[PDB]
Amino acid sequence: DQRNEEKAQREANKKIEKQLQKDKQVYRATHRLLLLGAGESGKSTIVKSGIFETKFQVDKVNFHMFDVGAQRDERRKWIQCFNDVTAIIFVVASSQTNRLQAALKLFDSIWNNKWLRDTSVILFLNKQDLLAEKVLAIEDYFPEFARYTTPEDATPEPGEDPRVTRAKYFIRDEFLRISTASGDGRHYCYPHFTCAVDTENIRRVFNDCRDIIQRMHLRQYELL
Amino acid sequence: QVQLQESGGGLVQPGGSLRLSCAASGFTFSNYKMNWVRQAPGKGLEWVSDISQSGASISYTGSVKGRFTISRDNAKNTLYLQMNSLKPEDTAVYYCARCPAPFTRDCFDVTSTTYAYRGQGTQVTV
Amino acid sequence: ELDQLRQEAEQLKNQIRDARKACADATLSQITNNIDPVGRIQMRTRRTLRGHLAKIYAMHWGTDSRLLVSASQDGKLIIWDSYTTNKVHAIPLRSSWVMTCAYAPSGNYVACGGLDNICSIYNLKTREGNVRVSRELAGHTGYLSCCRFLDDNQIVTSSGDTTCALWDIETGQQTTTFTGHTGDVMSLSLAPDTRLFVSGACDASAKLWDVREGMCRQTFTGHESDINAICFFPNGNAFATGSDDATCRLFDLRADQELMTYSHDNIICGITSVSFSKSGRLLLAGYDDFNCNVWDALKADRAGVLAGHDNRVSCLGVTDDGMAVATGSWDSFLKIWN
Amino acid sequence: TASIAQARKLVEQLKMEANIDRIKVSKAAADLMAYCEAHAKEDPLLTPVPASENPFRE
Amino acid sequence: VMTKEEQIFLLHRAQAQCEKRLKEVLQRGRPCLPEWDHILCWPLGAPGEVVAVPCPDYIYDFNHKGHAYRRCDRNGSWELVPGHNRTWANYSECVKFLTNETREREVFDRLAMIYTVGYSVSLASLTVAVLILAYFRRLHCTRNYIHMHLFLSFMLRAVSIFVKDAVLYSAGYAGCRVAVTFFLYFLATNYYWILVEGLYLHSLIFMAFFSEKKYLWGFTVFGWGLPAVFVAVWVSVRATLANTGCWDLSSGNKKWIIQVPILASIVLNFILFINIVRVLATKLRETNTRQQYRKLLKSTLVLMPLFGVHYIVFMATPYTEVSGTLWQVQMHYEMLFNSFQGFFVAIIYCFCNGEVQAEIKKSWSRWTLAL
Amino acid sequence: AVSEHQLLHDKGKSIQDLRRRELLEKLLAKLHT
């Protein structure tokens, strides 16, 4: 006679599914970002416990940013959690020891990982004022600068040195050399130039995420 | 047991040369990608050079291109580094690091302060 | 005298190698060469469990072999009735990066944990009825990779700060701390009698610990990469490990040696989970190639392949009575085989 | 200097685990073989169960 | 527009008037009295005249500018044809007129064959496609739900055309009308499901953030509901203001109830098609060459049958003479394309899709290993 | 104009035109010839 005991079970399960549907619709409406960087890279300037959580809303769209606080510098076991995010925000101090080449090696390992093959990167090349004032005051660490020439897509603001443009475009090309050699249309790279204080970075993340989702949809229909 | 022991360091007249060697035991040397890292006194662990499973792809850092040469000998289980035209900025303890997982295009945490698949080092002082 | 300590350590490890190579009078294959083979073993997906929005990292059976917990990185624990495919509970978590879940042998508690460096303990049999959190055990420095209960008052945790810990839930304090792993400790497995446990870290090393003397007893090597899974043998005199080198290995606690390797030429994917049968004659192993192979434990032959997940299987568990095996995977699905 | 303490505690741990009585591998293999043989009939995954006694599809 | 029954009625009315006029003459020389010859009423004629009567205005196919001639004998009777028990007459001026020659019969049988082969192929393919999409649980998405609805619309369109030209062409009864109504409704629903898929892709790209359940129910009602509305209005205005026979013959300017919404859907879907190709060109350009244009071309050609951009070629064409070449090329073109569109959608989106191929391969592999 | 709808009308008209012609031709049959 224990249908008395089984109908209670079916009722509890029904309540659970009617809540899980609400959780589903709040989950898939939110975007998740992984803020990754090195020490003294400007990762904390963009924000302004193993995980720090940041919640914000641009144009009525809810983003959810995460920063690994209290973890060691091993990364090969906990970076596999952050597949199935929209983008990996990667911050680099583009300006002792070669931190630029280390950021390059980290970007290469993230790009070619078997589990992050489907996750794209929003590259933020920070500290452009420092790079400018150091270039007016790079060849020792990278021998192909003296060989390098400024690209045809060079679009600096009015009032720019023709030699700082070349430095920042060299660094961008050094990241695109990695991001271009593999993937052929499953993940992308969105490089950007940011200074110390500018509020356009939030809108840039918004636009890059819109592009990423649109590409996902156009790939479901096999149009890309 | 994974074991990596480096050899060949010493004192070199600035402008001299060295051939560092790395013996490996405890794993199939042919399934992995191998590395050289570097620790100058007072500075962190930086990256010098990698080599693929077959020595097809070879990458170097900017300040060693044209001077250093990496090479494998898979039958002899030995990895090499040929350091030429040495500078005082090359005085550091050199390690022979192995990427963690086999058959992988990537490998992550070689320049970490506590990395398991790294030798104990050898000293080069120019 | 750093160099003197180096050469002392090398002399010690060579003495240990000499002590181990004298006790290997014969191999396990030479002794189980006359055993009849297990026969091809074919299982079928009885139940598929749906409801998780994202990847499943952990599952644990209950000690009654009906109830089952799972953890998804969307931020929900779910307790299932596997006989009826009904969700008995659905617990919202505070941090969504769960990486481990455990079940109390009494049945009144569930523990989660992950990238928040905290092990939360939920009370299922509560006076009101809804599942609240009982304790949040803070005190680790890195992420929480595994956790297993001992009684309703104790729990052993494994972490990314190269450290295992023994907790007292009523106080929230750390009774004993275990040190010695040079890499991230990825797994634990308690002995049947709850007097030892073995842990495997990302330095290709398994260690044996005494829960009451708080010290490490033996250290086992043999793997070439990180150790992802550890399961004890049903009697507590052996254990099996899975690595990123696409091999399982069988170690002995009384011989202090490795006995068997389970490898194949066409397996170049790492191993995620490991489990023994109730008899110990089959070893179940989940792989990154989305499959689960079933090995003969006393031999090195594959007896079957569980196929059916379309993403990385990350979870295995055999019931206490040995009826079913349950697999979870990154396709957000649980399956029960028989 | 902390490397000195690290190395000496490594030496003491190696000394602790270097003196333990070992049995021969033949004996331990015999034990595992015997346990596998004594519980062969009490194992549903190795010897399947009649569908009346299978709680998952009757 | 001119039925046989109406022509008979007009002849009846003409005879009734002829008889009344004859009675007035019959009750009142040697003229030849008026007479009804089954088509026209001859007037009173004088002896010896050849009586010329303008072609009747109530005979649809006669030359309204001609005259019929009848000879009135001098003896006060209509002239007889030698050797025959009949009077003489010559109607040639009225009838030479209509000697046009039927040829278009085949043009209609050829059209029927074209579209019956097309619809048979499409129906078979699309049943297979809906079964494939429904069995495999992994292929259950919102996209595949809209695809399922599109396939169902195609299949019902084909079935309705078959039932219509089996019931109507083997009139004035209920079942003929039900057949025509179902034909029109299923046409409308197919067009509107084409428009729904265009709108869904447009919203997935340009909105990209929307609730799937609300939008799915809204599109489900848009795809089967608005057709119900305007086909209901059409049967309402038919059953009251026309109600003439089977409703297949066009009745005066109220065919636009069903036809204005369809043409609106066609122009809207063409606009959305252009917009999608624009965003594809932008995105393929910002990727970083002639692989560019090859991929753009392949995407445009695979989108070509889903949005159904072949209708915009002739949708502006009005109703044309059947004897014209515009009618001929339009009918052959549109029959051949409308009949094979469902086959094209089936191939492109259920047999050449990657997900369905991987799924059928893995199921086939597991069931090969099962034996 | 939707082709299928137009074709419906065009074929229906052709059928009606033939039947109307048959009436007048049978009458003209003996009346003129």
What CATH number is given to the structural domain containing E164? 1.20.1070.10
D interface with C, Cβ–Cβ < 8 A, is: 3-4, 7-8, 10-11, 13-18, 20, 22-33, 35-36, 39-40, 42-46, 48-49, 54-57
In a 13 Å sphere around the CA of B2, the CA atoms on its Cβ side amount to 25
Classified as helix, coil or strand, C328 is: strand
Q: Which amino acid is at E301?
A: L
**Nearest partner of C231 among C287, C283, C158, C184, judged by Cα:** C283
Rounded distance between C-alpha atoms, residue B99 and residue B36, angstroms: 11
Rounded distance between C-alpha atoms, residue C211 and residue E303, angstroms: 66
* Nearest CB to C226; choose among B1, B100, B103: B100
From the CA of C236, how many Å to the nearest CA of chain E?
37
* Nearest CB to C323; choose among D15, D33, D55: D55
| Of E98, E133, E163, the domain-final residue | E98
Neighbours of C212 (CB within 10 A): 12
Q: What angle do CA E186, E191, E193 make, to 5 degrees?
A: 95
Helical packing angle, F3-32 and E325-346, nearest 10°:
140
Report chain A residues whose CB lies below 8 A from the CB of B100: 76
Query: Token pair of E63, please?
Result: 């030359």
Place of tokens 């931020």: C75
Spatial neighbors of E266 by CB under 8 A, at least 6 apart, are E191, E308, E311, E312, E315
Q: Could you please report the per-residue DSSP string of F1-33?
A: --HHHHHHHHHHHHHHHHHHHHHHHHHHHHHH-
In a 13 Å sphere around the CA of C153, the CA atoms on its Cβ side amount to 4
Is B80 in contact with B71 (CB distance < 8 Å)?
Answer: yes
Q: Verify whether the Cβ–Cβ distance E138 to C310 is below 8 Å.
A: yes
Give the number of B-C residue pairs with CB atoms closer than 8 Å: 35
Is C167 in contact with C155 (CB distance < 8 Å)?
Answer: yes
Minimal Cα distance from B26: which residue of C?
Answer: C224
Rounded distance between C-alpha atoms, residue D15 and residue D9, angstroms: 10
Query: Token pair of C132, please?
Result: 């609240």
From the CA of E8, how many Å to the nearest CA of chain F?
9
Q: Could you please report the per-residue DSSP string of E171-229?
A: --SHHHHHHHHHHHHHHHHHHHHHHHHHHHHHHHHHT----HHHHHHHHHHHHHSHHHH
Q: Verify whether the Cβ–Cβ distance A71 to C160 is below 8 Å.
A: yes
From the CA of D39, how many Å to the nearest CA of chain C?
5
**Nearest partner of D40 among C325, C279, C36, judged by Cα:** C279
Place of tokens 């445009």: E300
Classified as helix, coil or strand, E146 is: helix
Q: Is A27 exposed, middle or buried (0-12, 13-18, 19+ CB in 10 A)?
A: middle
Neighbours of A107 (CB within 10 A): 21
Q: Verify whether the Cβ–Cβ distance B114 to C268 is below 8 Å.
A: no
Classified as helix, coil or strand, E346 is: helix
CATH code at B79?
2.60.40.10
Is B97 in contact with B34 (CB distance < 8 Å)?
Answer: yes
Rounded distance between C-alpha atoms, residue E93 and residue E110, angstroms: 35
From the CA of A171, how many Å to the nearest CA of chain E?
18
Classified as helix, coil or strand, A69 is: coil
Classified as helix, coil or strand, C237 is: coil
Distances (CA, A) of B96 to A104, B33, B91, C91: 20, 11, 16, 48
Neighbours of E296 (CB within 10 A): 16
Q: Which amino acid is at C120?
A: S
Distances (CA, A) of E35 to C135, C272, E22, E38: 116, 107, 7, 9
**Nearest partner of E139 among E359, E367, E346, judged by Cα:** E359
Minimal Cα distance from D54: which residue of C?
Answer: C323
Report chain D residues whose CB lies below 8 A from the CB of C31: 26, 29-30, 33
Spatial neighbors of E12 by CB under 8 A, at least 6 apart, are none
Mutate to test the interface with A, among C50, C87, C268, C330 (most CBs of A within 10 A): C87
Report chain C residues whose CB lies below 8 A from the CB of B102: 224-225, 244-246, 268
Looking at the structure, tell me whether residues E317 and E241 fall in a common domain.
yes
Distances (CA, A) of C92 to C43, C97, C147, E331: 33, 12, 19, 62
F26 interface with E at CB cutoff 8 Å = no
- Per the structure, the count of domains in chain D is 1
**Nearest partner of B90 among B116, B122, B114, judged by Cα:** B122
Place of tokens 């002896």: E47
Q: What is the dihedral of CA E9, E14, E17, E18, to 10 degrees?
A: -140
Mutate to test the interface with C, among B28, B106, B114 (most CBs of C within 10 A): B114
Report chain E residues whose CB lies below 8 A from the CB of F29: none
* Domain housing C110: 2-337
Looking at the structure, tell me whether residues E109 and E222 fall in a common domain.
yes
Give the number of A-B residue pairs with CB atoms closer than 8 Å: 52
Q: Is B32 exposed, middle or buried (0-12, 13-18, 19+ CB in 10 A)?
A: buried
Mutate to test the interface with F, among E40, E322, E328, E333 (most CBs of F within 10 A): E322
- Per the structure, the count of domains in chain B is 1
Is D11 in contact with C12 (CB distance < 8 Å)?
Answer: yes
Query: Token pair of E299, please?
Result: 């995407």
Q: Could you please report the per-residue DSSP string of C129-143?
A: SS-EEEEEEE--SS-
Sign of CA dihedral E218, E221, E224, E227: negative
In a domain, A25, yes or no: no
Distances (CA, A) of E328 to B4, E96, E183, F3: 84, 27, 23, 11
C310 interface with E at CB cutoff 8 Å = yes
Minimal Cα distance from E333: which residue of F?
Answer: F3
Q: Which amino acid is at A56?
A: F
Query: Token pair of A88, please?
Result: 């990996």
Report chain E residues whose CB lies below 8 A from the CB of A217: 204-205, 208
Looking at the structure, tell me whether residues E85 and E172 fall in a common domain.
no
Radius of gyration of chain C (CA): 20
Runs of H (alpha helix) within chain E: 4-26, 92-95, 104-135, 142-167, 174-206, 212-224, 226-237, 256-285, 291-303, 325-346, 354-370
Spatial neighbors of A215 by CB under 8 A, at least 6 apart, are A188, A224, E283
Q: What is the dihedral of CA E219, E224, E230, E232, to 10 degrees?
A: -150
Q: Verify whether the Cβ–Cβ distance C224 to B27 is below 8 Å.
A: yes
- Per the structure, the count of domains in chain C is 1
Q: How far is CA A81 from the centre of its chain?
A: 15
Helix (H) / strand (E) element for C316: namely strand C313-318
Looking at the structure, tell me whether residues E273 and E138 fall in a common domain.
yes
* Domain housing A86: 30-220
Q: How far is CA E154 from the centre of its chain?
A: 16
**Nearest partner of E345 among E309, E314, E302, judged by Cα:** E302
Sign of CA dihedral A36, B110, B17, B67: negative
Question: Which pairing describes strands C292-296 and C205-210: parallel, antiparallel, or unpaired?
Answer: unpaired
**Nearest partner of C52 among C337, C330, C338, C275, judged by Cα:** C330
Minimal Cα distance from C333: which residue of E?
Answer: E138
Q: Verify whether the Cβ–Cβ distance E209 to A25 is below 8 Å.
A: no
Q: What's the N-to-C CA distance of chain B in angstroms?
A: 33
Rounded distance between C-alpha atoms, residue A99 and residue A107, angstroms: 12
Task: For chain A, list the strands marked E by DSSP.
Answer: 30-36, 51-58, 61-68, 87-93, 120-126, 189-193
Is E77 in contact with E98 (CB distance < 8 Å)?
Answer: no
**Nearest partner of A190 among A30, A28, A33, A27, judged by Cα:** A33
For E327-362, give one letter per residue: b (16+ CB within 10 A) or e. Answer: beebbeebbbbbbbbbbbbbebbbeebeebeebeee
For E302-320, give one letter per residue: b (16+ CB within 10 A) or e. Answer: bbebbbbbbbeebbeeeeb
* Domain housing D21: 2-57
From the CA of B108, how many Å to the nearest CA of chain A?
6
Neighbours of E251 (CB within 10 A): 17
Residue B3 has φ and ψ, to the nearest 5°, of -140, 130
Rounded distance between C-alpha atoms, residue C3 and residue C1, angstroms: 6
Distances (CA, A) of E339 to A189, E20, E167, E259, E348: 45, 58, 20, 19, 16
CB < 8 Å & 24+ apart, contacts of C163-166? C164/C188, C164/C197, C164/C199, C164/C209, C165/C139, C165/C140, C166/C211, C166/C214
Resolution (A): 2.9
Q: Which amino acid is at C104?
A: A
Classified as helix, coil or strand, C198 is: strand
Identify the bridge partners of residue C200 per DSSP, sorted by sequence position. Answer: C187, C206
Spatial neighbors of C323 by CB under 8 A, at least 6 apart, are C65, C338, D44, D45, D49, D54, D55, D56
Sign of CA dihedral A200, A206, A212, A217: negative
Sign of CA dihedral C245, C247, C248, C249: negative
C203 interface with B at CB cutoff 8 Å = yes
Residue E127 has φ and ψ, to the nearest 5°, of -60, -45
Looking at the structure, tell me whether residues E165 and E314 fall in a common domain.
yes
Is C132 in contact with C109 (CB distance < 8 Å)?
Answer: no
Is C149 in contact with C103 (CB distance < 8 Å)?
Answer: yes
Q: What is the dihedral of CA E326, E330, E333, E337, to 10 degrees?
A: 170
Rounded distance between C-alpha atoms, residue A119 and residue A215, angstroms: 12
Helix (H) / strand (E) element for C314: namely strand C313-318
Rounded distance between C-alpha atoms, residue C61 and residue C318, angstroms: 8
Residue A55 DSSP class: E
Rounded distance between C-alpha atoms, residue C120 and residue C100, angstroms: 11
* Nearest CB to F19; choose among E4, E89, E169: E4
C204 interface with B at CB cutoff 8 Å = yes
Q: Verify whether the Cβ–Cβ distance B114 to C183 is below 8 Å.
A: yes
Residue E55 DSSP class: P
Rounded distance between C-alpha atoms, residue C301 and residue C260, angstroms: 11
Looking at the structure, tell me whether residues E143 and E79 fall in a common domain.
no
C5: alpha, beta or left? (left if phi > 0; alpha if psi -120 to 50): alpha
**Nearest partner of C295 among C260, C268, C322, judged by Cα:** C260
Q: What is the dihedral of CA B77, C243, B3, A99, to 10 degrees?
A: 90
Q: Verify whether the Cβ–Cβ distance A109 to B107 is below 8 Å.
A: yes
Is C303 in contact with C264 (CB distance < 8 Å)?
Answer: no
Rounded distance between C-alpha atoms, residue E183 and residue E190, angstroms: 11
Q: Could you please report the per-residue DSSP string of B40-74?
A: -TTS-EEEEEEE-SSTT-EEE-GGGTTTEEEEEET
Distances (CA, A) of E307 to C177, E129, E188, E206, E300: 66, 19, 15, 17, 10
Residue E89 has φ and ψ, to the nearest 5°, of -155, 160
Query: Token pair of B33, please?
Result: 């990608």
Which residues 72-111 on chain A approach chain C with CB closer than 8 angstroms?
72, 74, 76-78, 81, 84
Rounded distance between C-alpha atoms, residue E262 and residue C225, angstroms: 65
Minimal Cα distance from E339: which residue of F?
Answer: F4
* Domain housing E25: 4-98
In a 13 Å sphere around the CA of B104, the CA atoms on its Cβ side amount to 26
Mutate to test the interface with A, among E209, E213, E300, E349 (most CBs of A within 10 A): E209
Report chain C residues whose CB lies below 8 A from the CB of D18: 12, 15-16, 19
In a 13 Å sphere around the CA of B6, the CA atoms on its Cβ side amount to 27
Distances (CA, A) of E352 to A129, A186, E119, E227: 52, 20, 20, 31
CATH code at E54?
4.10.1240.10
Is C236 in contact with C193 (CB distance < 8 Å)?
Answer: yes
| Of E98, E116, E148, the domain-final residue | E98
Classified as helix, coil or strand, D41 is: coil
Spatial neighbors of B44 by CB under 8 A, at least 6 apart, are A97, B111
Radius of gyration of chain E (CA): 31
Is E198 in contact with E269 (CB distance < 8 Å)?
Answer: yes
Q: Verify whether the Cβ–Cβ distance A101 to B107 is below 8 Å.
A: no
Q: What's the N-to-C CA distance of chain A in angstroms?
A: 59
Rounded distance between C-alpha atoms, residue A86 and residue A105, angstroms: 22
Rounded distance between C-alpha atoms, residue C65 and residue C57, angstroms: 20
Minimal Cα distance from F5: which residue of E?
Answer: E184
Looking at the structure, tell me whether residues E19 and E166 fall in a common domain.
no
Classified as helix, coil or strand, C194 is: coil
CATH code at A124?
3.40.50.300
Chains C and B make contact, 3+ CB pairs within 8 Å: yes
Residue E182 has φ and ψ, to the nearest 5°, of -65, -40
Minimal Cα distance from C40: which residue of D?
Answer: D46
Rounded distance between C-alpha atoms, residue E161 and residue E119, angstroms: 9
Place of tokens 């608005």: E226
Q: Could you please report the per-residue DSSP string of C63-128?
A: TTSSEEEEEETTTEEEEEETTTTEEEEEEE-SSS-EEEEEE-SSSSEEEEEETTSEEEEEESS-SS
Query: Token pair of A158, please?
Result: 């009015």
Is E300 in contact with E274 (CB distance < 8 Å)?
Answer: no
E interface with A, Cβ–Cβ < 8 A, is: 143, 201, 204-205, 208-209, 211, 213, 279-280, 283-284, 287, 295, 299, 302-303, 353-354
Rounded distance between C-alpha atoms, residue B61 and residue B46, angstroms: 9
Runs of H (alpha helix) within chain D: 2-18, 25-38
Spatial neighbors of E96 by CB under 8 A, at least 6 apart, are E63
